[PDB]
Amino acid sequence: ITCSGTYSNVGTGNYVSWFQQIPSAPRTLIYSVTNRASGVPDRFSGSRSGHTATLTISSLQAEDEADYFCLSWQSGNTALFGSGT
Amino acid sequence: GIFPVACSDGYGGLVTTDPKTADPAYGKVFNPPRNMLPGRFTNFLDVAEACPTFLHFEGDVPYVTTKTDSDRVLAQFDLSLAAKHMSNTFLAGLAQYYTQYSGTINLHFMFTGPTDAKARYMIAYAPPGMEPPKTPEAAAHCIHAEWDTGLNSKFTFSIPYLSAADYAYTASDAAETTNVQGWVCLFQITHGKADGDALVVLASAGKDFELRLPVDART
Amino acid sequence: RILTTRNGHTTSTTQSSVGVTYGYATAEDFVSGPNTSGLETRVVQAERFFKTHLFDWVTSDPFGRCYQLELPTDHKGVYGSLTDSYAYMRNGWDVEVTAVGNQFNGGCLLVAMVPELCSIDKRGLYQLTLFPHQFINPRTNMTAHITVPFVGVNRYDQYKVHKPWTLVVMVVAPLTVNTEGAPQIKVYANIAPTNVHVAGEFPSKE
Amino acid sequence: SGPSLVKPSQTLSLTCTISGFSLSSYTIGWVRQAPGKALEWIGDMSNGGMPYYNPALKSRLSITKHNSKSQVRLSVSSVTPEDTATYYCAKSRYTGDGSIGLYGVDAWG
Amino acid sequence: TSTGESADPVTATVENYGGETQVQRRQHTDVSFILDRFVKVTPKDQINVLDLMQTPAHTLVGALLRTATYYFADLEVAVKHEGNLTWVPNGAPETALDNTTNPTAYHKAPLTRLALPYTAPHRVLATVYNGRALPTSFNYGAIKATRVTELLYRMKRAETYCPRPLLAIHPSEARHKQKIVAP
Amino acid sequence: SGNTGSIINNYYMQQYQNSMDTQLGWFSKLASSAFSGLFGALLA
Numbered sequence: 039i040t041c042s043g044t045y046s047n048v049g050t051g052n053y054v055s056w057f058q059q060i061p062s063a064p065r066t067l068i069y070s071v072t073n074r075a076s077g078v079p080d081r082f083s084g085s086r087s088g089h090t091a092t093l094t095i096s097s098l099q100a101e102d103e104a105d106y107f108c109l110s111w112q113s114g115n116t117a118l119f120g121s122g123t
Numbered sequence: 124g125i126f127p128v129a130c131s132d133g134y135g136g137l138v139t140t141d142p143k144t145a146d147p148a149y150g151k152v153f154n155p156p157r158n159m160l161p162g163r164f165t166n167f168l169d170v171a172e173a174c175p176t177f178l179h180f181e182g183d184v185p186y187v188t189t190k191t192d193s194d195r196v197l198a199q200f201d202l203s204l205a206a207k208h209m210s211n212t213f214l215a216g217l218a219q220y221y222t223q224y225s226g227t228i229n230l231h232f233m234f235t236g237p238t239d240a241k242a243r244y245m246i247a248y249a250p251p252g253m254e255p256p257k258t259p260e261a262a263a264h265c266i267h268a269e270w271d272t273g274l275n276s277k278f279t280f281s282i283p284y285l286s287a288a289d290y291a292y293t294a295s296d297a298a299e300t301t302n303v304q305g306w307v308c309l310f311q312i313t314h315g316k317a318d319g320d321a322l323v324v325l326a327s328a329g330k331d332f333e334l335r336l337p338v339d340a341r342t
Numbered sequence: 343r344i345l346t347t348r349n350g351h352t353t354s355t356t357q358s359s360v361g362v363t364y365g366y367a368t369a370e371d372f373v374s375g376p377n378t379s380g381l382e383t384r385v386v387q388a389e390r391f392f393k394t395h396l397f398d399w400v401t402s403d404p405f406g407r408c409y410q411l412e413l414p415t416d417h418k419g420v421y422g423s424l425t426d427s428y429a430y431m432r433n434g435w436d437v438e439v440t441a442v443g444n445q446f447n448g449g450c451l452l453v454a455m456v457p458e459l460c461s462i463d464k465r466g467l468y469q470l471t472l473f474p475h476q477f478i479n480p481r482t483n484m485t486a487h488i489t490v491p492f493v494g495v496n497r498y499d500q501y502k503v504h505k506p507w508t509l510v511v512m513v514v515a516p517l518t519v520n521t522e523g524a525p526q527i528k529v530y531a532n533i534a535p536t537n538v539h540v541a542g543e544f545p546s547k548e
Numbered sequence: 549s550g551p552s553l554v555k556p557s558q559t560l561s562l563t564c565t566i567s568g569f570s571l572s573s574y575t576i577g578w579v580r581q582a583p584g585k586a587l588e589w590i591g592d593m594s595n596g597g598m599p600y601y602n603p604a605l606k607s608r609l610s611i612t613k614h615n616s617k618s619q620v621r622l623s624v625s626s627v628t629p630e631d632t633a634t635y636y637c638a639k640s641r642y643t644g645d646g647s648i649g650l651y652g653v654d655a656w657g
Numbered sequence: 658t659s660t661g662e663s664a665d666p667v668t669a670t671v672e673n674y675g676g677e678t679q680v681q682r683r684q685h686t687d688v689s690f691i692l693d694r695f696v697k698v699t700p701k702d703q704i705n706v707l708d709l710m711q712t713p714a715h716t717l718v719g720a721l722l723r724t725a726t727y728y729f730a731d732l733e734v735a736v737k738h739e740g741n742l743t744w745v746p747n748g749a750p751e752t753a754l755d756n757t758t759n760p761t762a763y764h765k766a767p768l769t770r771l772a773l774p775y776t777a778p779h780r781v782l783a784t785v786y787n788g789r790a791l792p793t794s795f796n797y798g799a800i801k802a803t804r805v806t807e808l809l810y811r812m813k814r815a816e817t818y819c820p821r822p823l824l825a826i827h828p829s830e831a832r833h834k835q836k837i838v839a840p
Numbered sequence: 841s842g843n844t845g846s847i848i849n850n851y852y853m854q855q856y857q858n859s860m861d862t863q864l865g866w867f868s869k870l871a872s873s874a875f876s877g878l879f880g881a882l883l884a
Contacts, residue, residue: 051397051409053652063549064581065636069657088461109587111650113395113528116603118649120587132766133735140760142856222748223778227379249545250429252502256545264427264546266381285542286378286430286497288794289862290778294750298793305542331376336746336776339758360663366819372864400646402656450662457726457819458787466822471664473819479662493727493819496780504788517643525600525647659879667875673882693843731858775859814842814858820867 041108041122043090048110054086055093056109056120064107168217172328175231176213186235186321189242189314196257197244197309201302202228202282204293212326218334219342223290226332227283231325234276240317245269246280247308251287255306262308269312281329282307294340345487349436349534350390356440360483365455365474367491370434370537375497378430382539388421391534396439396511398528399451401518406464408512410456412505413437414535421535428540430498434491435507438532443480447527448519452477453511455490467512477514480527489536498541509533554632557625559610564637565619575645576620577638578611585633589649592640593620600647688725692812694718695735700808706749707734707773707797709810710784718812720824725817727781732797733811735770742769742802747776749793754801761802768809773797781818 041054048054057068057078067075070084070093081101084093092108109120164171177185180198187198200208204218218224232244247267249255256262270278284291287303295302309324345359374382397409413435417423425431439453454475462470471477476486492499494506511529552560562578565571577592591601591611601609610623624631644656651657660667670678696712696719709730712719722728736742743754743761753759762769782795800808826833850857 046395048652050411051407053654053657055652055657063636064634065549065579065638067639069652071652071654072657074657107587109651111652113397116648117605118587118589118602118651121585133768133770136762136765136769136771138760138762138771139758142852222746222750225377247545248542250542252426252429252500252544254545261547262545264548265543283379283381283542284377285381286375287500288495288779289375289377289497290748292748292778294748296749296751296793331379336748338746338748338750339753339756340750341752341756360661363664366866375864376862400650400653401643402646402650402653404655407654452664458783458785460785460787460789462822465824465827469822472822475664477662477664482662494783494786504786506787508787520596520598520643525598525645658875658877665875666870666873670874670876672876673878689841690843772857780862813844 039094039106039108039123040092041090041110043092043110045089047112047114047119049089050113052111052113054090054108054110055084056107057082058107059102060107061103168214168328169333171213171217172229172332174213175229175325175327177211178324178326179208179211180324186323187309189236189311189318189320189322191314191318195259195311197311199255199306199308201295201306202304203295203302204228205295206302209326214326214328218293219340220337221334222293222336222338224293224332224334225284225290227281227329228332229327229329230280230282231327232270232276232278232280233323233325234272234320235323236272236317236320240315240320241272242314242317242320243269243271243312244322245310245312247310248282249306249308250285251301251303251305256308259310259312262310267308290335293334347438347487349536350387352391354391354532356485358483359485359487360476360478362487362489363474363476365488365490366493370491371496373539377497378541381541383541385424385538385540388424388538389535390420391438391532392417392419392421394531394533396509396529396531398526399449399513399518400526401520403513403517405513405516406467408462408464408467408510410459411509411531413507413509413533414501414505421538424538424540425501427543427546429500429542429544431501431538431540432492432498433535433538434489436487436489436534436536437509438485438487438534439478439509439511439529440485440532441478441480441529442524442527443478443484444523444527445480446521446523447480448521449513449515449517450477450479451511451529452514453486453488453509455488456508456510457490457493458506459508459510470510470512479515480523549634549636551632551634554627554629557627559624560622560627560631560635562622562635562637563619564635565617566637567618571615571618571620573642575640575642577640577649578620578622579636579638580631580633581636582633589638589651590622590624590635592638592645592649594640594643594645596643599645602648688817689815691721692718692815692817695809695811698808698810700805702804704799704801705805705808706799707732707808707810708791708795709782709797709812710791712810718810722817723784724821724823725819726784726821727818728784728812729775729781729816729818731775731813731815732773733770733813734773734800735768735809735811736800736802737768737806738764738802738804739806740803742800742805744771744773744800745798747796747798748778749796749798754799784821 053071055070057066058064059066071086073079073083081096105123107123112119180187200206204215209215245267247262247265249265268280291304345356347353374380437455454470454473456473474488474490476488478486499506573595575594578590580588580590593599593613608626612621694717696716698712710722743757743759745759778794
């Protein structure tokens with residue numbers, strides 16, 4: 039998956055990893071640049087690119103409901119920005 | 124004593140292109156005198172630029188027909204010495220066997236039309252950065268020349284070689300899609316009441332046109 | 343030790359500074375190579391400073407964080423889109439990174455001008471200090487000055503094909519120190535292109 | 549993990565605070581999340597008594613910083629009907645407060 | 658000695674407290690010398706292009722190039738090949754080695770040495786070039802005779818510009834212990 | 841220069857041997873510029 043995202047918002051030195059298993063706590067300590075917090079380490083592991091691209095996981099079958107959230111620190115407007123999905 | 128010496132396998136290998144004389148068996152042979160010869164050439168394409176050669180346009184015709192239309196764009200061919208529109212000039216025929224040209228390419232223009240009808244030709248350069256122009260007003264900003272054929276027609280022009288490096292290739296590789304040394308143009312910003320007045324173009328080598336690194340190619 | 347600066351028409355002097363830290367030369371190398379048919383024309387009106395906001399280290403920062411801004415980047419106003427109307431353009435660079443130390447921050451940030459860097463494997467970031475560099479600690483000097491002449495093929499470069507320089511602001515100091523100081527000190531880099539040249543102009547679309 | 553209230557103008561209260569582990573040596577955070585909208589970190593708490601809220605909602609926003617009962621009480625006045633979203637007791641490892649809300653940061657995750 | 662965070666070179670030189678320094682003969686590693694050692698290169702049969710940075714990461718003059726962003730060179734190839742090999746200029750043409758008549762050599766010994774002069778179209782080659790994979794410019798022609806067995810490069814009278822990070826094998830533990838040779 | 845002997849003029853002329861330099865019209869100059877001494881004095 040990927041979000042629509044300017045280079046300066048997260049591209050110039052930012053980290054995007056924000057993980058949810060909504061159906062209902064969106065607060066699952068869970069991340070994507072790294073695979074810590076123990077839960078969902080295999081088949082849900084992602085990573086980030088040189089510009090907006092967002093976590094990837096293993097294909098051809100789906101073992102999770104709804105879809106996941108992406109969060110990125112944004113430099114322009116000091117308030118954190120997160121949306122898309 | 125026998126004076127010793129160690130043969131080296133490396134640095135003694137036989138190769139074409141080394142300067143070690145043939146030392147042929149025949150000796151004391153006198154050739155016929157050959158001085159006062161009627162026309163020598165020290166070297167080609169560096170000093171063989173005295174004779175300018177024709178170019179190729181659409182239709183196997185070294186002359187471009189002055190056209191009358193809202194379209195005013197003339198032949199817009201690449202500069203690489205292996206581009207189509209020069210595929211038969213002596214410049215190209217000599218650049219093909221060598222791989223890189225470091226000097227300005229010199230064009231020529233003459234008017235075969237009658238005295239009654241004149242025109243205003245302008246030829247424009249375009250560096251490789253972006254799309255080659257399509258209209259004089261749009262190609263006006265880039266370096267270009269202007270002329271008109273009133274009292275003597277043959278007008279030289281010196282397409283200058285501006286650098287991405289100190290040399291540039293003469294065999295355009297199939298890798299890219301925009302030729303490296305950029306396009307050229309020919310433009311009829313205005314013509315009088317002349318028509319079907321041929322314009323023939325001539326190519327030749329200028330002052331700093333020094334090829335190097337001889338190679339082969341099937342040609 | 344106040345440091346003066348000037349380029350074109352705008353200038354901002356640093357209240358405290360360490361002093362310029364040159365690199366790879368003292369002045370530009372020979373300018374009009376016999377290859378480019380001498381069509382070069384110097385342009386004066388095109389060198390003025392231009393602010394550009396960069397990443398600001400916060401406490402959460404690990405040593406490894408690195409950041410590289412493609413130079414030169416999109417410009418607006420005088421010297422903005424000049425490259426477009428020219429090709430094979432060349433320029434030296436006078437970068438300037440400014441940060442607010444607070445006279446109370448332990449963390450040290452080091453910035454190095456690097457040529458043609460490729461994304462690192464995070465193992466050479468140690469030896470990164472080879473290239474011209476001046477590296478700041480808010481205790482003593484909150485700003486650094488760096489001037490490099492261009493280096494790559496000598497005659498000219500097409501800035502639309504390959505950028506030859508980069509900024510690298512990797513934070514040398516581990517994390518950051520919140521010793522009664524501002525929690526986040528955003529760093530600002532006043533890039534300043536010096537001594538440009540240009541060559542054969544594109545067919546405009548105006 | 550509740551949507552609280554929208555019509556009331558009183559400051560939203562979300563004391564989802566349980567002593568699983570203390571607030572004594574750790575950070576606790578507060579996030580706004582609607583059914584669907586942009587996500588904002590309302591606030592957070594780190595050891596050192598230095599908690600900073602978001603810049604856009606600076607004056608109207610305030611989070612209680614009491615260590616007794618490991619509690620956290622949102623202090624947000626002038627609440628508009630558009631503050632209709634679910635909040636969550638959000639926990640971070642230490643010194644992640646910075647000044648405004650940060651996550652996605654390495655070794656902080 | 659008052660380092661000002663200038664990052665300018667400053668050296669104590671072990672003078673302030675004890676004696677004087679024994680004379681430093683910083684010699685036998687000056688760039689023009691350590692780039693003469695020959696390097697093995699993984700060879701490709703029936704065709705290959707000679708590029709200097711094509712050496713295995715772990716080799717002396719195979720890794721002391723990436724210490725230099727730019728490098729002027731004169732390449733002395735030496736091949737152990739089974740048929741007539743051919744050589745080409747930097748301003749490369751495709752399918753010109755088939756007709757030969759380009760500088761070539763014959764096998765009169767186990768090792769054949771070719772002194773290709775500098776043929777690149779620029780002032781200096783590049784080892785990395787922002788834009789991975791270098792553009793088709795930085796190349797020393799090509800070599801293609803029969804099947805190639807072992808390939809050998811040698812930079813001669815070289816000169817390097819702008820020095821870049823080097824590595825050392827990352828010690829798994831303190832004082833990485835490499836087995837030294839002993840009688 | 842480079843790592844080689846050949847004190848006698850290499851039998852091949854230089855132009856044939858190796859390239860030649862274009863002509864128009866730093867890390868060693870760094871060492872000699874090294875800071876020395878102490879901020880103040882060296883007592884005793």
